[PDB]
Ligand binder design. Structure first.
Ligand SMILES: Nc1ncnc2c1ncn2[C@@H]1O[C@H](CSCC[C@H](N)C(=O)O)[C@@H](O)[C@H]1O
Ligand code: NA
Lengths: 265, 265
């Protein structure tokens, strides 16, 4: 009788850790959610096949409102696993679900998996240099979110990089591309005019991290805004002050304009 | 003709991903490094047995100075793997190794694995709230480094959390404990007197992330500075102002004193 929060990784069913696979294989019941992120290189079938279990997929409402009514009950008698894309507790509210488990008298364990948060390391940007992170959310109705713009500004002022998670509307199957994120940011810049995100701003795009051939592109907004970066998911990064070796990597590995080699110190 | 940068994950031999293990088993040669960090929950022998391949260990110099003469030559006509604790490319200087590969006409692919950068999410602290990261280094001779102190200050000042890596002497297998890190910071506070780290500062200690039984403790320095957090490696975090949900998780899961629910929120 226990509950396991098991991450599935970045792209496909093989991104799960060996620890996660072996424990997942021996659980009595297996639940999962696929709304907090997109695993573009797999399907539910391949996942079930790999674990050898039927996986009951839950909606955001099932989780946020009925986790303790659907999942916890079975944990009191059996070994249950709750699967999620990437790492279970990263850029989600899943951590709080452990508190519900405790209050229900259920012990929980966390099995980590590759996360986009550390995968950004493949962009060549020093991970210790990333500042506060933010999410570019789709405007809805008359409400136009802009907080993420202020985050970039705050980090940029300190010479730190900014990781931008992109919005997702799972039930509509809508995944925000880096192109859309860029369009929204220019509109915010037009509104606030803080000189934070313009046509000349250098940005980095990472698409489908975890796959063997992710798309990694670095360049000025004016040139990348209409570029095709392949299928989702995508994340956008606005680097801060670059180190020489970071610039070198962007140019050699991400096709960045050879001119960024000339870092203003 | 291919070089695979493969992450080994957080704690033991099972923290590597299914993708990483399968790829490693198919490589003709397998290298690894344990100078940036060590897999405290396993041994080289256990990792070798799992991959079913002989593993040649490389020192810091072998990598930084001779990567192209030791690893890349074999990658010209064979499939080669380079194993590192955590997620590949997280360690600052590793990204540059891909440039060396390109230069040698060698293709390289990155196989991600859990990293402490994302695993700290188990402390209940929101990932988006972490700011710049830093390493607490031991002072020595006439050298008393204190930059990590300024990092905490600049992050906390903006309501951001600070992830602190502790000094490690891989070769001599000597680890800096969280207790030691705290003592150093108190000593640094006495010199800079910026009111950044004192007996009343709330801190979180994460030990053996990745194991099924990690140590997660949150509390004020005056009460934790002499507490035993167990075997290394330890990770220290100086949280910024907490979201009530973060505070609740620390109280319920990390034994934090109820006091933080009013003092640090
Ligand atoms: N493989 C991948 N490549 C690019 N972006 C990714 C990605 N996986 C997740 N993301 C990004 O992160 C968002 C989900 S946020 C949830 C993240 C997850 N817990 C983790 O640990 O990675 C997506 O909308 C997308 O913008
Ligand atoms: Na960070």
């Amino acid at each position: 009788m226990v509950l396991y929060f098991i991450g599935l990784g970045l792209y496909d069913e093989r991104d799960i850790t060996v620890k996660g696979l072996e424990i997942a294989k021996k659980c009595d019941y297996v639940f999962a959610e696929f709304y907090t992120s997109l695993m573009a290189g797999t399907t539910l079938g391949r996942i079930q096949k790999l674990i050898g279990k039927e996986i009951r997929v839950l909606s955001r409402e099932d989780v946020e409102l009925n986790f303790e009514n659907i999942v916890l009950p079975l944990a009191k008698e059996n070994d249950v696993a709750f699967l999620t894309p990437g790492d279970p507790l990263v850029a989600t509210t899943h951590a709080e679900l452990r508190i519900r488990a405790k209050r229900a008298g259920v012990e929980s364990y966390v099995i980590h998996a590759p996360s986009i948060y550390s995968a950004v390391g493949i962009t060549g940007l020093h991970i210790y240099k990333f500042g506060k992170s933010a999410t570019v959310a789709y405007p809805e109705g008359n409400w136009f979110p802009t907080s993420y713009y202020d985050v970039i500004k705050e980090n940029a002022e300190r010479g730190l990089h900014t990781l931008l998670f992109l919005d997702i509307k799972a039930e509509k199957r809508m995944y925000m591309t880096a192109n859309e994120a860029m369009e929204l940011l220019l509109k915010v810049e037009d509104m606030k005019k803080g000189g934070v995100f313009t046509d000349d701003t250098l940005v980095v795009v990472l698409a489908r991290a975890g796959s063997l051939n992710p798309t990694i592109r670095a360049g000025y907004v004016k040139d990348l805004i209409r570029e095709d970066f392949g299928d989702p998911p995508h994340i956008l990064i606005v680097p801060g002050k670059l180190h020489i070796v970071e610039a070198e990597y962007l140019v050699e590995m991400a096709g960045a304009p050879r001119e960024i080699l000339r870092v203003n110190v």
